[PDB]
Amino acid sequence: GTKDYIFILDFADLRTGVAFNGVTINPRNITMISFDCTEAHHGLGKDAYIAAMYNNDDGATFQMEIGGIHTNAALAAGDKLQCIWRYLDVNGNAQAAENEFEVVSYEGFGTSNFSVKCKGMLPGKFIGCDAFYGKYLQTDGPIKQVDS
Amino acid sequence: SCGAELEANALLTALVAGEDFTLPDIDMSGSEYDIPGGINSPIYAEIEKITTEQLTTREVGGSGVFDALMQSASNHLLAEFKNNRITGGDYVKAYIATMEACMANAVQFLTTKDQAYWNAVTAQVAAITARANLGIIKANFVTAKIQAL
Amino acid sequence: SCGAELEANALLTALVAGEDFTLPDIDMSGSEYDIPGGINSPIYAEIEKITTEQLTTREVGGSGVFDALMQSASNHLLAEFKNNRITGGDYVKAYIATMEACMANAVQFLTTKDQAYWNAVTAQVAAITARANLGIIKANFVTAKIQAL
Amino acid sequence: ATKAEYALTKLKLSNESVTYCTAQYNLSSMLPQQLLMLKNQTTQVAEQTK
Amino acid sequence: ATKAEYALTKLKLSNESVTYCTAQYNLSSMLPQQLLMLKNQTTQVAEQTK
Amino acid sequence: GIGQIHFNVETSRKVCLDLAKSVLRLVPVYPLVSPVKKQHDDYWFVGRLGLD
């Protein structure tokens, strides 16, 4: 709800994470500092959302939907997706977690709704998702030309 | 009911009037009372056993304390040698001369460095616990005054 | 039943009103309060006794502290020797000269390295227990204030 | 066990309130009637003397 | 538990006040009537001797 | 305290089924249509200069 905001880069307390829960960079040895600039439509960017997530009977994989996606998008095996999701613990208490998942396969090109098979196990029953990151994919896709 | 609670409140308000007892207002969840890093701090990393291969790897290349101590001295001497200030013989003689002090210092650096670090995390933990103990002391002051009365 | 429990609840709600007592909300199963490794950590590995075969194996090859300390020096001298800087005599003389400091340092490295590691596990455990003790201190703050009242 | 002693103290509060209410009723409504009875008894003693 | 004992002590204050009030009433308004009854009983004893 | 004012879980599922059936009754078929109607293998990624 505002348009007057600042971006502050403090070289003390550099915590690497989506939710600032991770290793801290050592400020005493840095080679370059490059800002990551992308567009809104970069790789199913703006309007994606997780919807459902659940385990599979297989040893390895688990299933994940991806929600609203612009038509000109595709996923190849090996792409990585990050999200902040909430689950129900075994004891019955809600928790929050962040993770990075690989992909093995998917279905539904061009229909704007994907169902992706991903590697790994899930710690509990799904509740909701608060943030989703679907950037840096392998396969190319055309978009309407924009100058900014 | 007859409002025994109202009588108790009024009596307590009237009996202890004339003095001020204000409790401390420290909030102990403000991230100033937590150890800096989470699970990803170097405190929670696994400690590896010290072996001979961490002292010297029997190669001129490196990856050891003695090897690095020799290579740095060789680099400095070669830096002076590339300028037409010495010849090969002087460089070789100085290298051979330092070859033993390098070993003597390398044997000590490992043992001292494995302790110089672990003597500091304990100081961190002590200071962070001492903040909370100071808060408890501030809380005990008021109980001391009430004991006087 | 006459609701004795309801009367007690109302009486606490009325009598202690006007003050804030909020207990801490630490979750003490979050893996920040556990020793890093499981059974696979080197803490649970068997300790081997110190024997003379660990110092020197009476062979030029290796598998000992003294043998490795001699081989590294020999490798450095031979690396300088293959470059046209010294001859066989200089190499042999330097080798024989170092052959005593090698023994002197090898006798010490074993005994010091057996402690350099075990002085760090105790520090890790002390820090991890200090976190929980800090939690208990945060819990004791509120008891201190209520004792004052 | 320390958890259970807390509930015991709360129930003790609940009984204390009723003790207060009973004492207040006794003070307010029972004693003056006993005083009236004693006042009635003294005059009967005088009449017995007569 | 230390939180609950505080409320217990406050309710004890509440009962102590009523104990004081009852003692004061008994002193001020009840004992002199008993004294008057004794003064009435002694004369009846004298009449019985007569 | 107050009692019997909110649905159970099973009744909530039944009401949701009823709502889904009603909405499907209004809209039997999927209305939306997509410009891309084939799989990725059929299309050929080409680059052009500005249109015309």
mmCIF file of C-alpha atoms in Angstrom, chain B residues 49-140:
data_model
loop_
_atom_site.group_PDB
_atom_site.id
_atom_site.type_symbol
_atom_site.label_atom_id
_atom_site.label_comp_id
_atom_site.label_asym_id
_atom_site.label_seq_id
_atom_site.Cartn_x
_atom_site.Cartn_y
_atom_site.Cartn_z
ATOM 1 C CA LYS B 49 39.822 -34.975 14.550
ATOM 2 C CA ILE B 50 43.339 -33.638 14.038
ATOM 3 C CA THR B 51 45.525 -35.926 11.930
ATOM 4 C CA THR B 52 49.025 -35.854 10.486
ATOM 5 C CA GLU B 53 47.698 -34.987 7.024
ATOM 6 C CA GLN B 54 46.492 -31.655 8.413
ATOM 7 C CA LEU B 55 50.054 -30.798 9.428
ATOM 8 C CA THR B 56 51.884 -31.782 6.235
ATOM 9 C CA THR B 57 50.692 -33.676 3.156
ATOM 10 C CA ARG B 58 54.223 -34.680 2.029
ATOM 11 C CA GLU B 59 53.915 -32.532 -1.115
ATOM 12 C CA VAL B 60 55.410 -29.232 -2.228
ATOM 13 C CA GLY B 61 51.951 -28.045 -3.236
ATOM 14 C CA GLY B 62 50.060 -27.160 -0.082
ATOM 15 C CA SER B 63 46.993 -28.034 1.979
ATOM 16 C CA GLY B 64 49.072 -28.148 5.149
ATOM 17 C CA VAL B 65 50.372 -25.722 7.734
ATOM 18 C CA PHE B 66 54.032 -26.618 7.182
ATOM 19 C CA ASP B 67 53.614 -26.611 3.395
ATOM 20 C CA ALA B 68 51.934 -23.189 3.423
ATOM 21 C CA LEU B 69 54.572 -21.792 5.784
ATOM 22 C CA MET B 70 57.304 -22.942 3.396
ATOM 23 C CA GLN B 71 55.526 -21.738 0.255
ATOM 24 C CA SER B 72 54.978 -18.221 1.599
ATOM 25 C CA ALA B 73 58.676 -17.821 2.423
ATOM 26 C CA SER B 74 59.621 -19.215 -0.984
ATOM 27 C CA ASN B 75 57.259 -16.741 -2.663
ATOM 28 C CA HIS B 76 58.777 -13.794 -0.793
ATOM 29 C CA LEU B 77 62.333 -14.847 -1.649
ATOM 30 C CA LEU B 78 61.408 -15.385 -5.308
ATOM 31 C CA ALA B 79 59.767 -11.955 -5.350
ATOM 32 C CA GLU B 80 63.070 -10.429 -4.260
ATOM 33 C CA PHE B 81 64.885 -12.723 -6.710
ATOM 34 C CA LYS B 82 62.950 -11.661 -9.817
ATOM 35 C CA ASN B 83 64.241 -8.163 -9.249
ATOM 36 C CA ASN B 84 67.956 -8.340 -10.005
ATOM 37 C CA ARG B 85 68.892 -8.248 -6.329
ATOM 38 C CA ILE B 86 69.993 -11.847 -5.612
ATOM 39 C CA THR B 87 70.899 -15.033 -7.471
ATOM 40 C CA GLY B 88 69.754 -18.628 -7.166
ATOM 41 C CA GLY B 89 72.285 -19.575 -4.503
ATOM 42 C CA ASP B 90 71.185 -16.929 -2.006
ATOM 43 C CA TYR B 91 67.534 -17.917 -2.427
ATOM 44 C CA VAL B 92 68.325 -21.615 -1.958
ATOM 45 C CA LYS B 93 70.414 -20.969 1.152
ATOM 46 C CA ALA B 94 67.746 -18.791 2.780
ATOM 47 C CA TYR B 95 65.061 -21.375 1.968
ATOM 48 C CA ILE B 96 67.100 -24.186 3.529
ATOM 49 C CA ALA B 97 67.804 -22.011 6.574
ATOM 50 C CA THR B 98 64.116 -21.309 7.242
ATOM 51 C CA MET B 99 63.099 -24.946 6.594
ATOM 52 C CA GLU B 100 63.293 -25.716 10.327
ATOM 53 C CA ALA B 101 61.643 -22.645 11.868
ATOM 54 C CA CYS B 102 58.722 -23.321 9.533
ATOM 55 C CA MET B 103 58.293 -26.769 11.119
ATOM 56 C CA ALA B 104 58.732 -25.451 14.658
ATOM 57 C CA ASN B 105 55.971 -22.874 14.199
ATOM 58 C CA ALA B 106 53.670 -25.241 12.304
ATOM 59 C CA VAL B 107 53.673 -27.774 15.147
ATOM 60 C CA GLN B 108 52.446 -25.052 17.544
ATOM 61 C CA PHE B 109 49.933 -23.195 15.373
ATOM 62 C CA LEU B 110 47.481 -26.113 15.175
ATOM 63 C CA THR B 111 47.318 -26.749 18.915
ATOM 64 C CA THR B 112 46.994 -23.075 19.829
ATOM 65 C CA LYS B 113 44.454 -22.222 17.118
ATOM 66 C CA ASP B 114 42.109 -25.046 18.050
ATOM 67 C CA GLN B 115 41.670 -23.380 21.486
ATOM 68 C CA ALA B 116 41.907 -19.653 20.753
ATOM 69 C CA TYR B 117 38.500 -19.888 19.068
ATOM 70 C CA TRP B 118 36.670 -22.010 21.638
ATOM 71 C CA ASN B 119 37.772 -19.589 24.345
ATOM 72 C CA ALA B 120 35.564 -16.916 22.722
ATOM 73 C CA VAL B 121 32.154 -18.549 22.219
ATOM 74 C CA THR B 122 32.071 -19.143 25.972
ATOM 75 C CA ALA B 123 32.676 -15.424 26.525
ATOM 76 C CA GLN B 124 29.791 -14.628 24.173
ATOM 77 C CA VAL B 125 27.464 -16.994 26.025
ATOM 78 C CA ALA B 126 28.582 -15.595 29.382
ATOM 79 C CA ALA B 127 27.838 -12.000 28.366
ATOM 80 C CA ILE B 128 24.433 -12.863 26.905
ATOM 81 C CA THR B 129 23.459 -14.728 30.084
ATOM 82 C CA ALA B 130 24.801 -11.873 32.211
ATOM 83 C CA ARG B 131 22.319 -9.477 30.600
ATOM 84 C CA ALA B 132 19.445 -11.637 31.878
ATOM 85 C CA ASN B 133 21.058 -11.976 35.304
ATOM 86 C CA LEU B 134 21.288 -8.176 35.427
ATOM 87 C CA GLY B 135 17.566 -8.005 34.704
ATOM 88 C CA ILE B 136 16.883 -10.383 37.592
ATOM 89 C CA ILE B 137 18.996 -8.176 39.877
ATOM 90 C CA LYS B 138 16.908 -5.154 38.901
ATOM 91 C CA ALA B 139 13.851 -7.216 39.827
ATOM 92 C CA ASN B 140 15.318 -8.171 43.231
#
